[PDB]
Each structure stands twice: as C-alpha cells, then as structure tokens.
Enzyme design. Structure first.
Site, PDB file in Angstrom:
ATOM      1  CD  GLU A  87      82.057   1.359-101.517  1.00  0.00           C
ATOM      2  OE1 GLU A  87      81.316   1.989-102.240  1.00  0.00           O
ATOM      3  OE2 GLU A  87      81.637   0.435-100.745  1.00  0.00           O
ATOM      4  CG  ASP A  99      74.158   3.314-103.696  1.00  0.00           C
ATOM      5  OD1 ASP A  99      73.088   3.191-104.247  1.00  0.00           O
ATOM      6  OD2 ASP A  99      74.358   3.012-102.458  1.00  0.00           O
ATOM      7  CG  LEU A 136      73.682   6.015 -97.718  1.00  0.00           C
ATOM      8  CD1 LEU A 136      73.195   6.005 -99.161  1.00  0.00           C
ATOM      9  CD2 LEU A 136      73.017   4.872 -96.990  1.00  0.00           C
ATOM     10  CG  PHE A 152      82.601   0.727 -95.723  1.00  0.00           C
ATOM     11  CD1 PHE A 152      82.233   1.030 -97.033  1.00  0.00           C
ATOM     12  CD2 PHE A 152      83.271   1.697 -94.979  1.00  0.00           C
ATOM     13  CE1 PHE A 152      82.493   2.298 -97.566  1.00  0.00           C
ATOM     14  CE2 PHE A 152      83.590   2.940 -95.516  1.00  0.00           C
ATOM     15  CZ  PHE A 152      83.185   3.250 -96.813  1.00  0.00           C
ATOM     16  CB  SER A 175      78.168 -16.735 -93.782  1.00  0.00           C
ATOM     17  OG  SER A 175      77.394 -16.964 -94.922  1.00  0.00           O
ATOM     18  CG  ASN A 190      76.153 -20.000 -96.283  1.00  0.00           C
ATOM     19  OD1 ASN A 190      75.923 -18.909 -95.725  1.00  0.00           O
ATOM     20  ND2 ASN A 190      75.186 -20.883 -96.433  1.00  0.00           N
TER      21      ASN A 190
HETATM   22  C1  LIG Z   1      79.355 -12.838 -92.925  1.00  0.00           C
HETATM   23  C2  LIG Z   1      79.034 -11.936 -91.771  1.00  0.00           C
HETATM   24  C3  LIG Z   1      79.347 -10.478 -92.060  1.00  0.00           C
HETATM   25  C4  LIG Z   1      80.842 -10.243 -92.259  1.00  0.00           C
HETATM   26  C5  LIG Z   1      81.529 -10.273 -90.922  1.00  0.00           C
HETATM   27  C6  LIG Z   1      82.213 -11.397 -90.561  1.00  0.00           C
HETATM   28  C7  LIG Z   1      82.785 -11.487 -89.308  1.00  0.00           C
HETATM   29  C8  LIG Z   1      82.669 -10.466 -88.410  1.00  0.00           C
HETATM   30  C9  LIG Z   1      82.004  -9.302 -88.766  1.00  0.00           C
HETATM   31  C10 LIG Z   1      81.427  -9.202 -90.008  1.00  0.00           C
END
Ligand SMILES: CCCCc1ccccc1
Ligand SMILES: [Cl-]
Ligand SMILES: [Cl-]
EC number: 3.2.1.17
Length: 162
Positions: free
Chosen positions: A11, A20, A32, A104, A117, A132
């Site tokens: 950041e 940003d 932000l 974040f 994912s 992915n």
């Molecule tokens: C890919 C999902 C967002 C990133 C994330 C992964 C695991 C737990 C919290 C947050």
C-alpha cells in the site's frame, strides 16, 4: 516478515490525501476515506477518523494508528464471517497473512465472493487455487500486487516479498 510489513509494501505510505488505483480518496497506509468524488467529504471523513482538524494532512504516527486499526478490523471481519472463518482457521500463518491482505484491499464482501477459490484453499489445492484466483478483475486491475499475494498462497512462503 509479517502482515504489517507486507501491507506496508503493497500500500505504501502517503501523508496527504490521495486517490487510490480505483480513484478513491485515501490516506496513510491504504486507508480508504470515501468512495465519493468530493474532496470535502474526504476531508470530513479524515477529520472524523483522526479526531482533529487535519486539513488533509496527517502525521506518520496518525497513519500508523489508522493502519493498526484497519488490520485489526480486517482480521475481525474475517473471524466474524461464516464463509471466511473456517477457511482462515484451516490455513498456516503465512497464508493467513495473504488472506488478511485481500480482505484489507477489497473488503469482506469482495473476498467473500470468491467461493470457488475459497473451497480450493480450504482443500489445500494450492496450484489450482492460484490459477482460479488469477481469473478475476482484481488480478487484471492490480496484477503485480495480486501476483505477490497469489504466490504467497501458492507457496506458503514470503518469497514474493523478499
Ligand atoms: C479467496 C477468498 C478471500 C481471501 C481469504 C481467504 C481465506 C480466508 C479469508 C479470506
Ligand atoms: Cl476510522
Ligand atoms: Cl499492481
């Protein structure tokens, strides 16, 4: 290396209000302020966050205080999310830092909409998740940062940051 150092690298640190990558008024270490186009609204949100009449400028200490609060809120957001928590609990320490980074940057909402994912990470299918995760607007908009976070999830090491 740790979450704070990692986020400080991704950041940067700016002591004066700035826009940003999405064009939103921000300050400090990625804090932000508002999605509104109005600088005044941003200045108002800034003073309210700091507790003084800042005039769009803050000190390093103030920046770090916002940063601490934002990291804490991110984690807490994760732990409060029924979709996120279980995944996060399943990860090792380094990968948890990558999860915090994403939340974040994009909010719990943002990250919570990466279902596929999530499942892959929960299953520890690292390479698959990595692929992915790249099929996303996030990756296409901030590819260098996304690559560093993605490598972190893939490897479980801080290499991308060394
Ligand atoms: C890919 C999902 C967002 C990133 C994330 C992964 C695991 C737990 C919290 C947050
Ligand atoms: Cl705040
Ligand atoms: Cl980038």
């Amino acid at each position: 290396m740790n979450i704070f150092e990692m986020l400080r690298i991704d950041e940067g640190l700016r002591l004066k209000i700035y826009k940003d990558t999405e064009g939103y008024y921000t300050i400090g270490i990625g804090h932000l302020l508002t999605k509104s186009p109005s600088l005044n609204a941003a200045k108002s949100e800034l003073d309210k966050a700091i507790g003084r009449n800042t005039n769009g400028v803050i000190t390093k200490d103030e920046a770090e205080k916002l940063f601490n609060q934002d990291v804490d809120a991110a984690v807490r957001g994760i732990l409060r999310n029924a979709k996120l928590k279980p995944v996060y609990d399943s990860l090792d320490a380094v990968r948890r830092a990558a999860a915090i980074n994403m939340v974040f940057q994009m909010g719990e909402t943002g990250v919570a909409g990466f279902t596929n994912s999530l499942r892959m990470l929960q299953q520890k299918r690292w390479d698959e998740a990595a692929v992915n995760l790249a099929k996303s607007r996030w990756y296409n908009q901030t590819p260098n940062r996304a690559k560093r976070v993605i490598t972190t999830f893939r490897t479980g090491t801080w290499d991308a940051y060394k």
